[PDB]
Structure 1
Amino acid sequence: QVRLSQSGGQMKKPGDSMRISCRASGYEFINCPINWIRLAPGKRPEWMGWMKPRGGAVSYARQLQGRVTMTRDMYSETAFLELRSLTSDDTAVYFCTRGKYCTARDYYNWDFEHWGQGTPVTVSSASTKGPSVFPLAPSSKSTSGGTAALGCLVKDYFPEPVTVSWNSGALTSGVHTFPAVLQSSGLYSLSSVVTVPSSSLGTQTYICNVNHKPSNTKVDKKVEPKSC
């Protein structure tokens, strides 16, 4: 049975280099090229390159040319990957793979039946940044005896996560805290909303409690109707 066993996950800072290993067994190691594929959530799987144990011949993906190195150790039958000048875009799970068809005479490289378990690599700054909390006012419309919507926008924080409660957890019904989104600036942001009766806007006080443990930040924000 063909097996590929990869080394443990790791955390890195931008500027660092990284090395991961892929130990193979269950077949003639020198006959088959080994590939490296990385996966990040929301993005295409990205082929980094292949490496042939015979001679250590390599072919790197154009967009990684210069920053990637693929080697191997014949005796321990272990393939190695190195990636230099790490940035946030290198955050991913890294896999070594091998094609389904491989004999002593021939191979087809691209039908990846054999995968290692994968090696999680996170690249991020050690810096933290607390959120800015802006109110999403209930607006001066939406019926008189119906339901109004309100919330707060939790913008430009790093890293994940933030949590939001309302009125110290006393308010839970109709509350929706959305999954955060990553902005172009590299900072996160999310919204938390709650639907309440419109007739309670002039009586009940609504406060969102924003928690951000990495920056040691706890912020309360009162969301009230705009005065005009």
Structure 2
Amino acid sequence: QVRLSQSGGQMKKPGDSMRISCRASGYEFINCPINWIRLAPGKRPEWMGWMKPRYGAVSYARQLQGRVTMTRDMYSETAFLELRSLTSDDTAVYFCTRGKYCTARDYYNWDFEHWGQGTPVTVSSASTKGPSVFPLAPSSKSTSGGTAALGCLVKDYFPEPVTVSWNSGALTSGVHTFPAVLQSSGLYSLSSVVTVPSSSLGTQTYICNVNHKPSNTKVDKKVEPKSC
């Protein structure tokens, strides 16, 4: 039975180098190539390159030329991956793979039947930044028989996560806190909203409580209708 076993996950900073291994067994190691594929949530899986144990022949994806090195140890039947100059875009789960068809005479590299269990690698700055919390105000005229929407926009923090509660958790009904998005700036943002009876806008006070543990930040923001 063919098996591929990979080294454990690791956390890196920008600029660092990473090294992972993949130990193969259950077949003749030199008969077929080993590939490296990285999966990042939301992105297409990316082929990094293959390596043929025979003489350690390699082929690297063009876009990774100069940053990547694939080697192997013949005795321990182990393949190795090194990736230099890490950035946030390198955050991914890394797999080694081998084709389904592999004999002593012939192979087809690309039908990946065999995958290692995967090696998660996170590449992030050690710096932290607290959220900016802006209100999302209801409306102008209070309709006595309708429902109003309000919330607060939680912008430009790093890293994940932030959590939001309302009135210190007293208000839960109709609350939607959205999954964060990663902005072009490299910083995260999310929105938290809640629907409430429009008749309570002049009576009830609505505070969103924002928590961001990495920056040790807790901020309360009162969301009220704009005066005009």
Aligned residue pairs: how many? 228
Q: CA deviation at 1:222?
A: 0.1
Q: Distance in 2 between matches of 1:193 and 1:224?
A: 13
Deviation of 1:145 after TM superposition, in Å, equals 1.3
**Any stretches of 5+ residues in structure 1 without a counterpart?**
none
SS across alignment from 2:218: strand
For residue 142 of structure 1, report the CA deviation from its aligned partner. Answer: 6.7
Q: Distance in 1 between matches of 2:192 and 2:142?
A: 19
CA displacement 1:192-214 (0-9 Å, x = unmatched): 00000000000000000000000
Structure 2 distance, partners of 1:206, 1:53, is: 64
Structure 1 match to 2:48: 48
Aligned to 2:205: 205
| Aligned-pair CA distance for 1:144 | 2.5
- Structure 1 residue runs of 4 or more that deviate by more than 3 Å after TM superposition: none
- The CA distance in 1 between the partners of 2:51 and 2:33, in whole Å, is 5
CA displacement 1:72-99 (0-9 Å, x = unmatched) = 0000000000000000000000000000
Q: TM-score, normalised by structure 2?
A: 0.99
Structure 2 partner of 1:151: 151
Cα distance in 2 between the residues matched to 1:105 and 1:223: 71
- The 3-state SS of whatever aligns with 1:205 is coil
* 2:144–2:199 Cα contact (<8 Å) kept: yes
Task: Give the Cα–Cα distance (whole angstroms) in 2 for the partners of residues 201 and 219 of structure 1.
Answer: 22
Shift of 1:43: 0.2
Instruction: Among all aligned residue pairs of Structure 1 and Structure 2, give the percentage whose two residues are the same amino acid.
Output: 100
Query: How far did 1:141 drift?
Result: 4.3
Secondary structure in structure 1 of the residue aligned to 2:130: coil
Alignment CA distance shift 1:197-1:76 (3 Å): same
CA distance in 2, matches of 1:173, 1:23: 52
CA distance in 1, matches of 2:36, 2:144: 61
* Counterparts of 2:87 and 2:142, CA distance in 1: 47
Shift in Å, 1:140: 1.3
Instruction: String of CA shifts for 1:143-173, please: whole Å, max 9, x gaps.
Output: 3311000000000000000000000000000
SS at match of 1:151: strand
